[PDB]
Amino acid sequence: AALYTHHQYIAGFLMVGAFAHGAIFFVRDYDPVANKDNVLARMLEHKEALISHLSWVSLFLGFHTLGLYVHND
Amino acid sequence: ADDFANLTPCSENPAYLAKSKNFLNTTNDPNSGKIRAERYASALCGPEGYPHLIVDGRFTHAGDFLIPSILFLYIAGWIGWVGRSYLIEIRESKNPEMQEVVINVPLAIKKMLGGFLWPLAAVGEYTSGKLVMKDSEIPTSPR
Amino acid sequence: MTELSGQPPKFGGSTGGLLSKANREEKYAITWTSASEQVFEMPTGGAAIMNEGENLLYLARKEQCLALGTQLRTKFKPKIQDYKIYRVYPSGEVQYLHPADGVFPEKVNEGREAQGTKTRRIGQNPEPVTIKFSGKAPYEV
Amino acid sequence: ALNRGDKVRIKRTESYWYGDVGTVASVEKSGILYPVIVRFDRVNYNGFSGSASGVNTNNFAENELELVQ
Amino acid sequence: SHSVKIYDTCIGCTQCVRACPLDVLEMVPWDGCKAAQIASSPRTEDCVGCKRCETACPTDFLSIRVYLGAETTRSMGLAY
Amino acid sequence: TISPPEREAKAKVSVDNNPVPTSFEKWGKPGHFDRTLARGPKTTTWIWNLHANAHDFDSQTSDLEDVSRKIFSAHFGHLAVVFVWLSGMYFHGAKFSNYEGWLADPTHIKPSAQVVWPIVGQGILNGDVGGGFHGIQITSGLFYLWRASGFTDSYQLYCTAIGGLVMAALMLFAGWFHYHVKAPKLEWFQNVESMMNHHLAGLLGLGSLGWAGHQIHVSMPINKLLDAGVAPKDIPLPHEFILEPSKMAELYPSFAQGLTPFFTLNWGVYSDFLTFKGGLNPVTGGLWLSDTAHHHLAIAVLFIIAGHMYRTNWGIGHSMKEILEAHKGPFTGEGHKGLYEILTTSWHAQLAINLALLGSLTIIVAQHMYAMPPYPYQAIDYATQLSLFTHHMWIGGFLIVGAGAHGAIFMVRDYDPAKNVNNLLDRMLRHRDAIISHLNWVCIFLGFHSFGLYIHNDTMRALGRPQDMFSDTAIQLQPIFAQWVQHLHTLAPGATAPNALATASYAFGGETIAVAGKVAMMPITLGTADFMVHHIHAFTIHVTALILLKGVLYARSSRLVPDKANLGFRFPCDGPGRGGTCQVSGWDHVFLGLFWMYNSLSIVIFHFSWKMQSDVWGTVSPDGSVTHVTLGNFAQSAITINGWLRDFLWAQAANVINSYGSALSAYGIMFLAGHFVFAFSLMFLFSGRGYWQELIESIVWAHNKLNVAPAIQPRALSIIQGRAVGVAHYLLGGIVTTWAFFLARSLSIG
Amino acid sequence: DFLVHHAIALGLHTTALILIKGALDARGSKLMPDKKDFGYSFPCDGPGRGGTCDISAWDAFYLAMFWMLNTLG
Amino acid sequence: MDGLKSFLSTAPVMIMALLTFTAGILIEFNRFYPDLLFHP
Ligand code: CLA
Ligand code: CLA
Ligand code: CLA
Ligand code: CLA
Ligand SMILES: CCCCCCCCCCCCCCCC(=O)OC[C@H](COP(=O)(O)OC[C@@H](O)CO)OC(=O)CCCCCCCCCCCCCCC
Ligand SMILES: CC1=C(/C=C/C(C)=C/C=C/C(C)=C\C=C/C=C(C)\C=C\C=C(C)\C=C\C2=C(C)C[C@H](O)CC2(C)C)C(C)(C)C[C@@H](O)C1
Ligand SMILES: CC1=C(/C=C/C(C)=C/C=CC(/C)=C/C=C/C=C(C)/C=C/C=C(C)/C=C/C2=C(C)CCCC2(C)C)C(C)(C)CCC1
Ligand SMILES: CC1=C(C/C=C(\C)CCC[C@H](C)CCC[C@H](C)CCCC(C)C)C(=O)c2ccccc2C1=O
Ligand code: SF4
Ligand code: SF4
Ligand SMILES: [Cl-]
C-alpha cells in the first residue's frame, strides 16, 4: 500500500514539473521565427479553442459526476 | 452471448427479491414501495440487490440511457437555440445590454415558442452560414 | 537648499514619525508657507496645527512628504503650492526634490530631458530568445 | 483614406480589440503617429479594480487597420 | 531600482503623473500627439512600483510600462 | 400621496410634505441610486457592483438629511420583515405542530413544529416525536416560550400570527410614510438627550412593566396550575382572571389584600407572588416565573427612572455635550471634547458602538440562558439548550465584527481632523504603533501560553510520560479564581443575600436539579481542562481584537501607505510595489477578522458542547448518582489535541454519518454539504482573478466562434469580490457543517 | 469504480487544463499581451484593468498543484 | 403603469419565475409518476 501511493505522488509531481518547464520554454526559449508555421506554432494559433474545449469537457465531467454522487446520497 | 454473466435480472436476483418486499413509500401512495418492487423487477441487478444500468449502446437497455439522452439533448438544444436566437435579436434593438438585463418578455416568449424546430433552423443556418463564424473575423489574443 | 527656514508645526508628538535609521540613514523635510493658522492631518497620524507663514517638518520617507503636499493644495481654500520637499543626508547635505524645476511635474515645462522614452509599441518588444544569456531584458534594450 | 463612420478591423496584436471591428470617430490632421481615433461597442479592461466598465475609444495607425463595411 | 518606460502610443494626458505619489514621472514636450508632450521618468530612484501610473493610462493597453527590479530601501517603501 | 393634518403639540417635530413622490418607473431601472451604474451595464461586473453598493447611502448621496430619512424607513421595513417571520412561527405552531400534544406530557414527547411534504422519498424526514405526530423535531425552543407565556390553545397562536401580520403591515406602511408623505427633518433627529430619555423611559421601562403585568395576569396563574398537574383544558383563560378578580385575589395571599398597600409603601406584603426564591423550578427545570415578574417590574421602574436624566424642553436634565466636555484629565488632554459632535453626525460612528454592544449583549444572553434556564423544560431539552446557546453566540459574533467594520468606515468617511484636535480619538491616533505592537506581544504570549500547553500535553502523552502533563493527575493547573467565585455564589443565600433563598445558578455549586430522567443543571467543576480552554478562548479573542483594531487604527494611513485615506474604505491594495501592498484596507481587515471570529467561536462552542456532555449532562439514577454521557472524560481527555480529535470529533460525529435511513438523514446530508462549501471557498481564497479573466478570454472566443457572446462583456469577480465570496462560502460551509453535526448529535442523546 | 474513474478523469482534465492554459498564455494574452517581457514568475501587474492577481505562468503552476494533490488524494 | 411591468420582467424576477415554474413541473411529475430510474 505504501509503494504504490509513493510512486503515484512521485509521478504527480513529475507531471506538474513537465508542464511548469514547458511554460518556461514558451517564456525563455520559444523562437517564433525558427518554429514558424510548424506544429508547435499552430498550437499557439488555436490555443483559445484548446483551452475552451478543455473547460467544456471538465464541466461536462464535474457537473454529472457530482450530480450522480449527490443523487446517490 | 452470455453478456453480463455476473449480473442477474432483478426478477431472479436474491438480495433484490429480498429487499423488494420491504420498499419504502416515496409519495403518499402506500403501494409505491410495491410499485417499485414491480417496476424495477425488469432491470438487471447485482449480487447486492440494487439495479444496474448498461450504457454500452445495446438496444436491450435503450430505456436505461438512450431515451433520457435523447430527451435531454432535445430540451437542451431547445434552451440553447432560443437563447442564442434571442441574444442575436437583441443586437439590433435599443441598448444591447439593457435588454439583456431587462427581459423583453413579448420577444423572449415569441422566440421560446418557436424552438421546437431548432434542428431544422440550425441546419438552415449552417448551410447558409449563420451558425458558425470565421476565425479571421473574431477578436483573438496575441500568440 | 542653503538653509531650511521654517516653524515646526503645533503637534504633541506621535510614534509614527522618524526613527533611528531615519536619522542615521536619511530623512526628508518639507517647507511651505501657510496663509493663516489652521489644522492639518499628519501623514504619520493625528491632526496638527500649521504655523502662520513659513513652516518646516521632517518626515521619514519621500512618499509621506508628497502625500502631505497633495493634501495641502486640495483641502484648503488658500491652497499651498509653494511646498518644497528636500532630502537630508547624515552629513547635512540637503538637495532639492519636489518640485523639480520649480514647476509641478503635472503640466509640461521647457527644459526637461526625455528619460525612459521608447520609440516603439509594447507589442513590438524583441523576443527573449534573441537576448538570452545577456544581462539585458526585453525592455532594457 | 478613411472618413467618419467607416468599419475597420484592428490589427495591433497587443490591442484589446485585435480582431474586433470598431467605428472611426474622427481622424486628426498630419503630424501624429496615431491620428485615427476609433470607437468600439465593447469596453476594454481599463479601470481600477471593481470598476463598472472601461474605455471604448482609442487612436490607431492606418497600417494597423483594415476596412470592412 | 524599477524600470519605467514610455512608448510612442502615449497621448500626453498627464494622468499617470497626476496619479504618481512619489514625483517619479514628469512631462516633456514632444511632437507625437495633439498635446505635444510625452511622459518621462527621470527619478526612477523614487519609484516604489505601486502601478498607480499604469492604472491611470487611457490608450489601448498601456503606453507607460513599469517593470519591477532589484528592490532597495527606497523601492521597498521602508519608513522605519 | 395622502395629506394628514399636522400631528404635533408644541414639539420639536419637523417634516417635509411629500419630498419623494410615489412611482414605479424607478423599479425598472436597476442601479439608479448610483451615478456610475445608471449609464447601463457594459460588463458583468456592473451587476455585482450593483449589489455591493445597494445599501451604501454615502456613495449614493452626500446629504445627511436624505440618508437619515432613508435609514428610518429601512428600519421600518426590517421590522415588517421581522414581524412576517414571527407570524410565521406562530402560525406554524398553531396549525403545523403538536404544542397541545406536547403540553400534556412534556417529559414523554419531543417538540416539533414542521411537517415535510411526502414526496420523492423526503416524507421519511417526518420523525415520530411521540403522541402520533410526525414531523421535524424543533430546537429553537418555541413550545417552552409559549408555555411560559400562557399559550394553551391553537386559536391563541393563530391570533398571535394574525397580530404579527398586522404589525408587519403597519411597519411596512410607516416606512413608506416616513419617506414619501412626511419625512422628518434634521431637527427631529439630533435630539440624542431626548431620544435617550424616550428609549429608556418608554421602550425598555414600560415594556418590562407591561410584560410583568401580563405575567401576573396570564403567565403566573396558569403556569402555577401547569406545574401542579392540572390538564390544560381544565385550566381557565387569562381574561377570566380579570373578569373575576376574586379568583386572582384567592390564588395568591398577597392578592387577597387589594391594591392600596402598594401605593401606601407596603411592598413587603406582595411577597406571595413577587418572590425572590431563585434557583430553578423542580417541576419544569426552569426559572421561577414569580421571580421573573418581580424582576421585570424592578427593571421597568429602573428604566423609567433612567429615562429622566437628559435635558429636553423643560430645562431640567443633562446635556451629554456638557458631560463630555467636562471629562478631561492630565492624561488625555481635552478628553471627550468633540465626541458628542462625532456621534451626532456620523452614522457609522454610532453603528460601530451599537453593533459592538448588541453583539456583546447577545453573547451575554447565551451565557445567561444556558446556566439559568428561564423557560420550562428547556434544561431537559439538551438540543434546544445547545441550539439557543450557539445561535445567540453566532449572532453576537457577527454583530461584533460589524462594529470593527463600521469604525473604519467612520474613519475613512467621516473623521474630520480639524474636529478632533487633541482629544481621545486624536491622541489615540498618535500612538497607534504603541497599542498595536503591545497587543501583538499580548497575542503572541497568549498563543504560546495556552496552545503550546496542548501541544506539550499531546507530545508527553505520545511519548508515554504521564507525570509530565498539564492534567488533573500531574502538573495541575487549577483555576483558583473561578472556583472561588463559584463558592461565593454558592454561599450567597446565607450571607451577602439573606432574602435570596437559592443561588443564581446551580453551575457555581449546590444541589443537582433533574426533571424526568435527565438532569437540568449541576455544579460545573472547573479544573485544568477548563483553565487551558479558557486561555485558548482568551487568546483567540485577543487576536481577533488585534486584527479588527489594526483595521481601524490604520484605515487612514500608515508607514506603508501615507495616503490610504484617499483610497477609501473598500479597496484591494495599492499595487505590488513596496514589496507588496495586498490587503491593507479596513475592508481587508474585516475580511481577515471574520475568520478569526469563526475560529474563536469554533473552540467556544466545542468547549461548551463537550464540557456539558462530560461534566454536566447525563442521566440521573433513582438512588441519586449521576452518570454523564462521555463518562466525565473532559477533565481527563480534553487536555490534548488528540482527545478532541478522537473522543470529541470522531466519537460524537458518528451520529451524523450514520444518520442515513432515519429522520436525521438531512443532517448528514447538510454535514457533507458544508464540507463541500468549505472546500469550494478555498478556490476563491487561494487564487487570483488574473487567471480567471484570461480563461474567460478563451471562453469568450469560444462564444464568439458561434456568435453567442453577451453584449454584457463577462468579467471575472473583482479582487475584493473574490475575497468576499471566498470568506462567505468559508463561513457558510463551516457553520452548516457544525450546525448539522450539533443538531444530529444533540437529538441522539435521548 | 465507474464513478471514481470519472472523478479521476475530471481530476486529470482540469489539472491538465490549468497546466496548459498556464503554458500557452505564458507569453501573452488580452490582459497582458506583453507577458513574455515579464518573464516566467512575477507577482502580478497591479490592481488596474480590473485586477491582475495570480496572472503569471508560475501562478498557474501554483494553482494546478492543488488539483494534482486532490487527484492524488 | 409600465414602470412595474418592466420590474416584473427584470432578470432576477424572471429567472426566479422560470425556476419556480420548472420546479412545479418537476415536482408534480415526480408526484404522479415517481421513481423513474430509466424508461420501461
Ligand atoms: C470543493 C472545492 C472546489 C470545487 C467544487 C471546485 C470546482 C471547480 N473548479 Mg476548483 N479549485 C479548488 C476547489 C474547488 N474547485 C481549490 C482549493 C483550488 C486551488 C486554489 C482550485 C483551483 C482551480 C483552478 C485553477 C481551476 C478550477 C476549476 C474548477 C471548475 C471545473 C469545472 C467542473 O469541475 O465542472 C463542473 C462544476 C462543478 C462540479 C462545481 C459546481 C457545483 C455546483 C453546486 C453546481 C450547481 C450550481 C448551484 C446550484 C448554484 C446555485 C447557488 C445558490 C444556492 C445560491 C469547477 C467548478 C477550473 C475551471 O475554472 O474550469 C474551467 C480551473 O481552471 N479550480
Ligand atoms: C443563450 C445562452 C448560452 C448559450 C447558447 C451558450 C452556449 C455555449 N456555452 Mg455558455 N454560458 C452561458 C450561456 C450560454 N452559453 C452563461 C449565462 C454562462 C455563465 C454561467 C455560460 C458560461 C459558459 C462556460 C464557462 C462555458 C460555456 C461554454 C459554452 C459552449 C459549449 C456548451 C456548454 O458548455 O455546455 C453548456 C453551457 C453551460 C453549462 C453554461 C451555462 C449555460 C446557461 C446556464 C444557459 C443559458 C440560458 C439562457 C439564459 C437562455 C436565454 C433564453 C432567452 C429567451 C431569454 C456553447 C456554444 C463552454 C465553452 O467555452 O465552449 C466549449 C464553457 O466553458 N458557457
Ligand atoms: C408600492 C409602494 C412603493 C413604491 C411605488 C415605491 C417607490 C419608490 N421608492 Mg419606496 N418604499 C416603500 C414603498 C414604495 N416605494 C416602503 C413601504 C418603504 C419602507 C421600507 C420604502 C422605502 C424607500 C426608501 C428608503 C427609498 C425608497 C425609494 C423609492 C424610489 C426608488 C425605488 C427603487 O430604487 O426601486 C425599487 C426597489 C425595490 C423594488 C427593492 C426590492 C425590495 C427589497 C429587495 C426588499 C423588500 C423589503 C421590503 C421593503 C419589506 C419586506 C416586506 C415583508 C412582507 C417581508 C421609488 C420611486 C428610494 C428613493 O427615493 O430613491 C432615492 C429610497 O431611498 N423607498
Ligand atoms: C444592522 C447592521 C448593519 C448595517 C445596517 C450595515 C450596513 C452597511 N454595511 Mg455592513 N456589516 C455588518 C452589519 C451592518 N452593516 C456586520 C455585522 C458585518 C460583519 C460581517 C458587516 C460587514 C460589512 C462589510 C465588509 C461591508 C459592509 C458594508 C455596508 C454598507 C453597504 C451594504 C451593502 O454592501 O449592500 C448590501 C449587502 C449585500 C449585497 C451583502 C450580500 C451578501 C450576503 C452577506 C450573503 C449572505 C447569505 C445569506 C445571509 C445566507 C446564505 C443562504 C444562501 C444559500 C442563499 C451599509 C451601509 C460595505 C461598505 O462599503 O460599507 C460602507 C462593506 O463592504 N458591511
Ligand atoms: C483580569 C485582571 C486581574 C489582573 C490585574 C491586571 C491589572 C490591570 C491594570 C489596571 C487597569 C489599567 C487601566 C486603568 C488605568 C487608566 O485608565 O487610567 C486613566 C488614564 C486616563 O485617565 P484621565 O486622567 O485622562 O481621565 C480623564 C478621562 O475622563 C478622559 O479624559 O487612562 C490611561 O491610563 C491610558 C493608558 C491605558 C493603557 C493601560 C491599560 C492597560 C491595558 C490592559 C488592561 C487590563 C484590564 C483587564 C480588565 C479585565
Ligand atoms: C454511441 C453513443 C455514445 C458515443 C458517443 C460518441 C462517442 C460521442 C461523439 C462526439 C463527437 C466527437 C462530437 C459531436 C459533435 C461535435 C460538433 C462540433 C458539435 C457542434 C455543436 C454546436 C455547433 C452547437 C451549437 C448550438 C446548437 C445548434 C444548439 C444549442 O442549443 C445552442 C448552440 C450550442 C449554440 C456512447 C457514450 C458510447 C454510449 C452509447 O450508448 C451511445
Ligand atoms: C491500446 C493499447 C495499446 C496501445 C497503446 C498506445 C500506443 C497508446 C497511448 C498513449 C499515449 C502516448 C498517451 C500519452 C501521454 C502523453 C503525455 C502525458 C505527454 C506529455 C508532454 C507534455 C505535456 C509537454 C508539453 C510541452 C509544453 C508544455 C510546451 C513546451 C514543449 C513541451 C513538449 C515541453 C497496445 C496495443 C500497445 C497495448 C494494449 C493497449
Ligand atoms: C472562479 C473565480 C472567479 C470567477 C467567478 C465567477 C465568474 C463567478 C461566477 C458567477 C456565475 C456566473 C453565477 C452563478 C452563481 C450565482 C450567484 C448563483 C445564483 C443562482 C440563482 C439564480 C438561483 C473570480 O472572478 C475570482 C476572482 C478573484 C479570486 C478568485 C476568483 C475565482 O476563483
Ligand atoms: S497616462 Fe499613459 S498615455 Fe497618458 S500621458 Fe501618462 S504615460 Fe502617456
Ligand atoms: S509605478 Fe507607481 S510609484 Fe512608480 S512611477 Fe508609476 S505610479 Fe509612480
Ligand atoms: Cl488523547
Author numbering:
A (entry chain B): 367 to 439
B (entry chain F): 1 to 143
C (entry chain D): 1 to 141
D (entry chain E): 2 to 70
E (entry chain C): 2 to 81
F (entry chain A): 2 to 751
G (entry chain B): 513 to 585
H (entry chain J): 1 to 40
Paper text:
In the light dependent stage two large, multi-subunit, pigment-protein complexes known as Photosystem I and II (PSI and PSII), are embedded in the thylakoid membranes, absorb light and turn physical energy into energy stored in chemical bonds. PSII mediates light-dependent water oxidation, which supplies electrons and protons to the photosynthetic process and releases oxygen, while PSI mediates NADP+ photo-reduction. In cyanobacteria, PSI is found in a trimeric or monomeric form, though recently has been reported to appear also in a tetrameric form. Under optimal growth conditions, the trimeric form of Synechocystis PSI is more abundant, whereas the monomeric form is present as a smaller fraction of the total complex.
To investigate the Synechocystis PSI monomer we performed a single histidine addition to the C-terminus of PsaL to generate a PsaLHIS mutant strain. The mutated strain generated mostly monomers (monomer-to-trimer ratio is 4.5:1), which allowed us to examine the monomer structure more easily, now constituting the major fraction of PSI, while taking specific interest in the trimerisation site. The crystals generated from PSI of PsaLHIS were solved to 4 Å resolution and showed some differences in PSI structure, in comparison to WT PSI, primarily in the region of PsaL, and PsaI. The C-terminus region of the PsaL in the native trimeric PSI (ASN144-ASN157) creates a short helix which can interact with the neighbor monomer’s PsaL and assist in trimerisation stabilization, however, the addition of a terminal histidine has disrupted the short helical structure and created a loose C-terminus in PsaL. The largest dislocation and structural differences in the PSI subunits was observed in PsaM, PsaI and PsaL which are all located at the trimerisation area. Despite a shift of 2–3 Å in PsaI location toward PsaM and away from PsaL, both carotenoids that were coordinated by this subunit remained in their position and orientation. However, a dislocation of about 1 Å in PsaM from its original position caused carotenoid M4021 to interact exclusively with PsaM whereas in the native form it is coordinated by both PsaM and PsaI. Moreover, the WT PsaL contains three chlorophyll a molecules and two β-carotenes, whereas the PsaLHIS monomer contains only one chlorophyll a molecule and no β-carotene molecules. Whichever the case may be, the results suggest that these ligands, that are possibly incorporated during trimerisation, might play a structural role and not just participate in excitation energy transfer dissipation. Despite the change to PSI super complex’s oligomeric state in the new PsaLHIS strain, the kinetic tests we preformed showed no significant effect on the activity of PSI.
